[PDB]
């Protein structure tokens, strides 16, 4: 405990001393890039999607979200969004005319993890659907925390 260090009792921590909850919210909107270029919340498919992130998409259900209660780790996709693009482009070796959508997903923070607490769907001022995903984790005191 020299130089402003502290010695905290491990057993007291085990019984609930200074334990905390942490909530983080991710917001996402679908936006009208044009008259009929509206983004759509969905589960992207590798068959017809570009720039899909290296994180797993398995945890997303049909409407491109995650039901509350599912454990999520770093870089896992929690909001699946796609935007239309001009078709008939061939490049990169594995890009065919089927890749008519660009992935605009929102992955979880690369360092954080926890249980998805609450997802909320609603409409913005312009009338377009948007969502907010709140994720809950537990912070237990350890070596390095400041008191």
């Amino acid at each position: 405990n020299q130089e402003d260090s502290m010695i905290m009792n491990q057993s007291s921590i085990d019984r609930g001393l200074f334990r905390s909850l942490f909530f983080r919210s991710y917001m996402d909107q679908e936006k009208k890039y044009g008259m009929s270029i509206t983004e759509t919340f969905e589960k992207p498919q590798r068959t017809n999607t570009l720039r899909m992130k290296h994180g797993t998409y398995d945890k997303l259900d049909d409407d491109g979200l995650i039901a509350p209660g599912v454990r999520v780790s770093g870089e896992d996709v929690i909001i699946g969004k796609t935007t239309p693009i001009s078709p008939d482009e061939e490049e990169l070796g594995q890009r065919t005319a089927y890749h008519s959508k660009r992935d605009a997903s929102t992955p979880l923070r690369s360092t954080e993890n926890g249980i998805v607490d609450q997802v909320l769907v609603t409409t913005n001022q312009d009338g377009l659907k948007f969502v907010k995903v709140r994720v809950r984790t537990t912070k237990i005191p350890q070596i390095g925390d400041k008191f």
């Binding site: 057993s11 007291s12 085990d14 019984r15 609930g16 334990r19 249980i115 809950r136 537990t138």
Partner: protein, 265 residues
């Protein structure tokens, strides 16, 4: 012949005794073992089917893991790590189930008397949550407004307080020796007179006060300890002491066994 014991107070949850004719190391080792080496049963895994309460799931799981459970026959249960089942079975765990609904117009208190044992116990005396108060309701687990429901299933394994403090059966253990400071193991802080400023311990009545003129006894060692063991409730307070002695003896015997088995190879 050996360590001698004389107990002053015997209660349901406290035992107060004197441990004489024994070394300081032995008494301290016994105290440490009683603190964090006696196996006990406690809830370890929680499956939350439904939770519409105002508390988080891991909040309730943390509260549930801290509920004391009967551990009289915990020696018959096996650790989950050295059992042949997949995740949990009847030979190594006890399955409880909590199911509460807020059907009343007022707030409904979910206590620990509402926990129900589902898995068969095969005649053992483990699993039942410990009830202490006069009302009969155990630990207040949660509270429900009207229309809120909490359904969950708990798996309880055996463990020791080293792995987690929730498995500790011993609460606070009072330990004292040499109330009159005849061994001079402390140098008393004082302003005017150290005798007036330091209150006498209750154990000073059990030893002869120093004559105030005799020379310092440099050959005297430390013995005749005064101890008081409290029980959380998982096991009776006398069983805490007995099983602590047994566990320390087992540790020393295991050292002997390892020494002999590596001596023969």
């Amino acid at each position: 012949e050996g360590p001698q014991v004389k107990i002053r107070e015997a209660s349901k949850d406290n035992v107060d005794f004197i441990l004489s004719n024994v070394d300081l190391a032995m008494a301290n080792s016994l105290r440490r073992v009683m603190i964090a080496e006696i196996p006990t049963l406690a809830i370890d895994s929680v499956e939350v089917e439904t939770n519409t309460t105002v508390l988080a799931d891991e909040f309730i799981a943390h509260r549930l893991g801290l509920i004391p459970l009967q551990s009289m026959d915990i020696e018959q249960l096996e650790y989950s790590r050295d059992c042949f089942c997949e995740d949990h079975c009847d030979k190594c765990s006890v399955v409880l189930t909590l199911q509460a609904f807020g059907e009343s117009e007022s707030t409904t208190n979910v206590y620990s008397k509402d926990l129900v044992i589902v898995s068969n116990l095969m005649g053992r005396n483990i699993g039942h949550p410990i009830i202490q108060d006069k009302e009969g309701n155990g630990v207040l687990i949660c509270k429900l407004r009207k229309g809120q429901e909490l359904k969950l299933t708990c798996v309880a394994k055996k463990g020791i307080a080293k792995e987690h403090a929730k498995w500790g059966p011993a609460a606070a253990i009072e330990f004292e020796y040499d109330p009159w400071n005849k061994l001079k193991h402390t140098d008393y802080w004082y302003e005017q007179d150290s005798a007036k400023e330091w209150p006498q311990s209750k154990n000073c009545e059990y030893e002869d006060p120093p004559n105030e003129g005799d020379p310092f006894d440099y050959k005297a060692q430390a013995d005749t300890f005064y101890m008081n063991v409290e029980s959380v409730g998982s096991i009776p307070v006398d069983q805490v002491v007995v099983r602590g002695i047994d566990t320390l003896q087992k540790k020393v015997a295991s050292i002997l066994l390892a020494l002999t088995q590596m001596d023969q190879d």
